[PDB]
Amino acid sequence: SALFEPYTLKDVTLRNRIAIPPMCQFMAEDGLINDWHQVHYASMARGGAGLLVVEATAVAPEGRITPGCAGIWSDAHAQAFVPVVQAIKAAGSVPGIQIAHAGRKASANRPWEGDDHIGADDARGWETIAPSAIAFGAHLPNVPRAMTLDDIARVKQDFVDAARRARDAGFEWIELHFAHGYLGQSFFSEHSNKRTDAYGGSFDNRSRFLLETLAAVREVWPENLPLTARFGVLEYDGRDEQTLEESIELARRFKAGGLDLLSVSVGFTIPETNIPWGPAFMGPIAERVRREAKLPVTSAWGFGTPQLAEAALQANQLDLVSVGRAHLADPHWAYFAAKELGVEKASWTLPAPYAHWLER
Amino acid sequence: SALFEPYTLKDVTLRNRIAIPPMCQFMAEDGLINDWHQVHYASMARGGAGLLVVEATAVAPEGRITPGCAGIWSDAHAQAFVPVVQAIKAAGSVPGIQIAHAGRKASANRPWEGDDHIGADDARGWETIAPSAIAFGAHLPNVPRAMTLDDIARVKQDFVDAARRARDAGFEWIELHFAHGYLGQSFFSEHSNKRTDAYGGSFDNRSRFLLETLAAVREVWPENLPLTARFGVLEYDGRDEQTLEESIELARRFKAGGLDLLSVSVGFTIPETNIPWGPAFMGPIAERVRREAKLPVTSAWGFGTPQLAEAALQANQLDLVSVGRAHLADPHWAYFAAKELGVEKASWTLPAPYAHWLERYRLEH
Ligand SMILES: Cc1cc2nc3c(=O)[nH]c(=O)nc-3n(C[C@H](O)[C@H](O)[C@H](O)COP(=O)(O)O)c2cc1C
Ligand SMILES: Cc1cc2nc3c(=O)[nH]c(=O)nc-3n(C[C@H](O)[C@H](O)[C@H](O)COP(=O)(O)O)c2cc1C
Ligand SMILES: CCOC(=O)/C(=N\O)C(C)=O
Ligand SMILES: CCOC(=O)/C(=N\O)C(C)=O
């Protein structure tokens, strides 16, 4: 089974090709994780996935999506991640973290608490920032404050500080969150970036915030640990061929700037789109990024059935298959996949106290 | 769905009829549980089961099955369970514990490390105790020493102390391990009990250790929390009708002694048996105990699919369905069962950070 072949990248060896992508839990308080996250991450890691990327973790308080989002904007926040890192590693998985800034989508309620913007004057809300003073719209109406050059410098340094904290907490894999309509994605997209200075307009200018942030993080993130990013490569906004071509060029520049692997996703920059509502539509798109930018990739969105994950690898569309919601449903999904694909000694995907009893 | 109806026993209410039965993890050191157990139990409790009975926990060091078994023979051992109790409760489940003494099956290797008795020249082992100096046989050849009267008094007091510690740690449900060929079961069975004193040689004498231990625990265990036991009611040794009749009479005496629920199992007292493993094969046996002894019951050993669990309740065989190995495979099995049975808002079997995203309407529209 291709899904259960190991994978090497820099000094890291993943025991299989199953990655758990970042999934916000909305359970932190003032950015601090707690026993929700400790059990959640340790259980999924014991389930057998080779890599576990911890949820979008804000580089600054205003970069949280919600009041429940994790943060890494102080040393105390970073120290709280140490037992999570160590439990993931003790399970034989590789601990990663996605560091993030929600941009204009920040200051929102938790998804099961309305999912909508909280006003900045509410005690629970705060002021949001973005490349341009233009709202997402729909349930996120609040107009963000357009960033100055000083704001750009400050946020970049927050990403750098977050990466250094993640390093010292023991994460072995980092992912910059440049996808999903948050700050980085919104600098890239002409829908949200109306700037006419050095950070807007041309392809070079729209790419600048992302490339400068990557380069600044690269100075502090160890050369021997994978440096990765998530990026939305199309929007399903009627401009897909041109947008994908530009995104592939940015991926080439990421590679030239030291990126080791790209998590290929959708932009979600604006609500006026027509994104597919079915599984594995990203397969051929991720494949094109991988082949044309000559860079390892992962992708997600419906690959959480064992045969689909296996097919994507056999087709060389992906190097790792990210499986998100299936791991919320079943933290031992990797074992389920091994069983379904007929892997020899499939139960030993799990630790001995489970594996011994579940042997075929 | 019957499987998702609440159940009340004494002053404890379970949110559904899915119980996670005790399952040894073999990961403790010197009886102390650790991060293995913390995550293991918290994750299963978040999975939605209404009751989680923590694994066989030794009342005394020599009553561990293996060097990896949990213990509760000191207050520090009990304190180690406090965060497990709290995590199970925080998840909305009810924390129980099975307190145990492995008897002649003690001093064994972990199942994936040979599963057999530790040899004499291995310093990890210890002398075992039992009603009589007779080995189980097969892969458990070590001969135990026959208990003295003082040993009997001491082990009973160890059960009392263990129950008091479990109570003080916050457990809301206790299960005495009188099954599976361990110390209590071995007092009841004529295969293993060769005594001629007050503790063997008649039905009353063979029942005595179990009834005295129950009564001693009852003095310290709160009236308002379920007092339960697991007991092997037949052996599949060619003596089933007579053995089941005696076991059901003992169950009636457990009820008279304040037992609130019986976990109905197989004796496993000796290896020379022919157990007819199959789907839900214990259903009719559990129903017979339930009806003849007039005691609520649970059982296990093949109910671990959503339809088998639901059917055992619809057939009036069980009050709670114990689902063991399926929860090792999938800690969120209770959610899986709710989904498979078409329960309304099935994903809300889980906490919100999972339930929101797994809502069937959200997934389908
Ligand atoms: C609860 C939840 C939280 C998510 N949080 C993040 C996040 O923090 N960062 C991110 O890049 N994507 C996030 N996403 C997207 C997932 O990483 C993934 O792409 C998506 O769930 C699709 O994969 P799946 O079909 O296997 O679930 C989240 C998805 C879910 C369901
Ligand atoms: C790993 C494991 C450990 C077990 N440990 C115990 C135990 O501590 N106490 C007990 O009474 N039964 C124990 N048993 C038996 C289970 O409680 C249960 O009866 C058995 O798994 C059958 O139910 P199932 O078909 O749902 O798995 C154990 C079973 C397993 C698989
Ligand atoms: C829909 C795209 O947005 C995401 O997946 C996400 N983070 O990236 C969350 C928290 O939902
Ligand atoms: C087979 C009967 O014995 C059991 O189920 C048991 N404990 O009760 C263990 C640890 O295996």
Side-chain angles (χ1 to χ4, degrees):
Chain A
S1 163
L3 189 59
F4 288 88
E5 297 176 12
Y7 181 66
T8 56
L9 192 58
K10 297 290 189 57
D11 280 1
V12 160
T13 302
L14 309 183
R15 62 187 165 195
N16 57 49
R17 306 305 183 94
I18 300 165
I20 301 178
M23 289 178 290
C24 280
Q25 298 297 289
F26 312 95
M27 290 293 284
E29 297 165 25
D30 310 317
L32 285 177
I33 62 161
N34 54 54
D35 283 337
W36 175 263
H37 312 81
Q38 187 62 41
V39 168
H40 163 73
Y41 286 118
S43 184
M44 292 192 303
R46 296 172 183 190
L51 170 69
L52 206 176
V53 183
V54 165
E55 63 198 276
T57 295
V59 305
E62 86 287 346
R64 286 176 292 170
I65 308 163
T66 75
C69 287
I72 196 165
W73 63 75
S74 79
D75 292 348
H77 288 86
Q79 293 184 3
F81 282 103
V82 169
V84 168
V85 170
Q86 291 180 353
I88 295 171
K89 187 176 179 71
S93 192
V94 169
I97 187 171
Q98 183 188 61
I99 61 168
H101 194 299
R104 70 183 182 176
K105 294 191 174 189
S107 191
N109 281 297
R110 302 199 288 180
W112 52 93
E113 294 170 344
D115 203 49
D116 54 349
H117 259 154
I118 311 165
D121 246 302
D122 190 303
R124 308 169 58 245
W126 62 84
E127 297 174 79
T128 63
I129 60 170
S132 301
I134 172 165
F136 178 90
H139 61 297
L140 301 171
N142 288 339
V143 183
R145 183 172 82 259
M147 291 168 69
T148 65
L149 297 186
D150 289 334
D151 292 326
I152 291 176
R154 190 272 297 173
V155 170
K156 286 191 299 182
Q157 186 63 45
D158 284 344
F159 273 88
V160 175
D161 292 347
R164 193 149 63 100
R165 290 186 189 107
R167 177 198 75 191
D168 287 352
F171 286 103
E172 297 175 357
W173 183 290
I174 197 164
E175 185 182 290
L176 307 183
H177 198 351
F178 295 160
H180 299 170
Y182 303 118
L183 188 66
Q185 186 85 56
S186 70
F187 268 95
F188 185 78
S189 176
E190 296 177 275
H191 287 295
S192 45
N193 183 342
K194 310 300 187 178
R195 303 177 73 95
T196 54
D197 73 348
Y199 290 87
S202 67
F203 170 82
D204 286 351
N205 287 6
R206 287 180 288 107
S207 296
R208 188 176 314 283
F209 176 81
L210 294 75
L211 291 169
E212 285 180 353
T213 296
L214 173 62
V217 165
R218 189 196 191 178
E219 293 184 320
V220 305
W221 185 254
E223 175 67 31
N224 72 322
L225 301 176
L227 172 58
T228 78
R230 199 167 209 183
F231 180 56
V233 299
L234 78 174
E235 301 279 347
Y236 293 99
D237 61 352
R239 317 167 65 213
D240 292 331
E241 182 53 37
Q242 175 184 27
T243 302
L244 183 54
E245 195 184 353
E246 287 194 6
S247 299
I248 291 170
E249 178 59 29
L250 186 55
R252 294 187 184 97
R253 302 190 187 192
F254 285 161
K255 181 180 177 181
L259 204 79
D260 295 308
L261 177 148
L262 186 65
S263 182
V264 176
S265 193
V266 178
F268 299 102
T269 297
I270 52 160
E272 301 89 359
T273 61
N274 291 278
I275 303 167
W277 298 147
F281 62 94
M282 292 300 295
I285 295 164
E287 192 277 335
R288 185 170 157 195
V289 175
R290 184 184 191 263
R291 180 169 39 78
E292 297 187 358
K294 298 148 183 292
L295 189 63
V297 301
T298 189
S299 197
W301 309 99
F303 290 100
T305 83
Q307 301 294 345
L308 272 177
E310 179 71 12
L313 292 165
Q314 290 188 10
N316 279 308
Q317 299 167 348
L318 307 181
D319 297 87
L320 302 173
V321 185
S322 294
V323 175
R325 283 167 292 174
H327 275 108
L328 307 183
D330 176 3
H332 297 180
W333 184 88
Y335 155 73
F336 172 75
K339 190 166 52 184
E340 284 288 317
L341 299 170
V343 174
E344 187 185 344
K345 293 298 180 184
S347 73
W348 288 90
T349 304
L350 298 174
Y354 305 154
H356 173 80
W357 305 101
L358 299 169
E359 285 174 351
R360 265 300 90 98
Chain B
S1 157
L3 194 59
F4 288 87
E5 290 180 357
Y7 180 66
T8 300
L9 186 59
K10 291 291 191 53
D11 295 343
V12 172
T13 296
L14 312 181
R15 62 186 167 194
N16 59 49
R17 308 302 184 100
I18 299 169
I20 302 176
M23 288 179 290
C24 279
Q25 298 297 289
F26 312 94
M27 290 294 285
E29 181 177 28
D30 302 319
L32 289 170
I33 63 160
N34 55 51
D35 284 347
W36 176 264
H37 311 82
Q38 186 60 42
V39 171
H40 164 74
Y41 286 119
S43 185
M44 289 193 305
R46 295 171 184 190
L51 172 65
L52 205 179
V53 184
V54 166
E55 63 198 273
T57 294
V59 304
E62 85 286 347
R64 288 177 292 170
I65 308 166
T66 77
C69 287
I72 197 167
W73 64 75
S74 81
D75 285 358
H77 284 87
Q79 177 61 37
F81 284 102
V82 171
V84 170
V85 171
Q86 290 310 312
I88 294 168
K89 290 174 65 59
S93 190
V94 168
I97 186 166
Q98 184 188 60
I99 59 169
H101 193 297
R104 69 183 182 176
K105 296 186 167 190
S107 192
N109 281 296
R110 303 198 291 178
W112 52 94
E113 294 170 343
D115 200 47
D116 58 336
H117 261 149
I118 297 167
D121 56 58
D122 186 334
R124 285 181 315 129
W126 59 86
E127 174 73 286
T128 58
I129 65 174
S132 300
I134 175 171
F136 177 87
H139 60 296
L140 299 169
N142 290 3
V143 182
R145 76 170 177 85
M147 286 171 72
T148 67
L149 294 185
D150 280 10
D151 287 325
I152 289 172
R154 190 270 298 173
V155 167
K156 287 193 293 178
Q157 188 62 47
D158 286 347
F159 272 91
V160 172
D161 289 349
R164 176 188 300 108
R165 290 185 188 108
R167 175 197 81 196
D168 294 340
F171 287 99
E172 294 171 352
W173 182 290
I174 197 168
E175 186 184 290
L176 306 182
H177 199 350
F178 292 165
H180 302 170
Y182 301 123
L183 190 65
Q185 185 86 57
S186 70
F187 269 97
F188 185 70
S189 177
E190 294 187 297
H191 288 295
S192 45
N193 187 337
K194 311 307 191 179
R195 302 179 74 92
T196 64
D197 69 355
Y199 292 90
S202 68
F203 174 79
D204 285 347
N205 285 10
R206 287 182 286 108
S207 298
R208 193 175 309 284
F209 175 81
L210 296 78
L211 289 168
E212 287 180 351
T213 298
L214 175 62
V217 166
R218 188 190 192 185
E219 296 191 320
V220 303
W221 185 253
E223 180 70 25
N224 75 338
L225 303 176
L227 175 54
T228 79
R230 197 167 208 182
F231 180 47
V233 301
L234 79 174
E235 302 283 343
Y236 294 105
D237 62 352
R239 307 169 67 216
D240 291 334
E241 185 56 33
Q242 183 185 24
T243 301
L244 189 53
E245 198 182 2
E246 289 193 18
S247 301
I248 289 172
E249 185 63 25
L250 184 54
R252 290 191 183 97
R253 292 162 200 207
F254 287 159
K255 180 184 178 72
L259 200 79
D260 297 309
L261 177 145
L262 191 67
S263 180
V264 174
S265 194
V266 174
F268 304 102
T269 300
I270 57 163
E272 300 90 357
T273 61
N274 189 20
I275 299 167
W277 304 106
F281 82 99
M282 292 292 295
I285 297 301
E287 183 200 356
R288 182 166 163 192
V289 176
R290 185 181 190 251
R291 290 194 181 281
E292 296 186 359
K294 294 293 194 249
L295 206 49
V297 301
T298 189
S299 195
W301 311 103
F303 297 100
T305 74
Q307 290 284 320
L308 288 169
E310 178 73 13
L313 298 166
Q314 294 287 342
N316 299 307
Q317 298 167 328
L318 305 182
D319 300 86
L320 300 172
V321 187
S322 292
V323 175
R325 283 167 292 174
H327 275 104
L328 306 183
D330 177 0
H332 298 177
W333 186 88
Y335 155 72
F336 171 76
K339 178 174 63 179
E340 291 292 291
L341 294 167
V343 167
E344 181 136 327
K345 297 172 71 272
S347 72
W348 287 89
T349 304
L350 297 175
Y354 306 153
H356 176 79
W357 308 104
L358 301 174
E359 288 175 350
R360 190 170 71 182
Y361 187 97
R362 185 172 315 276
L363 293 177
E364 293 180 347
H365 299 246

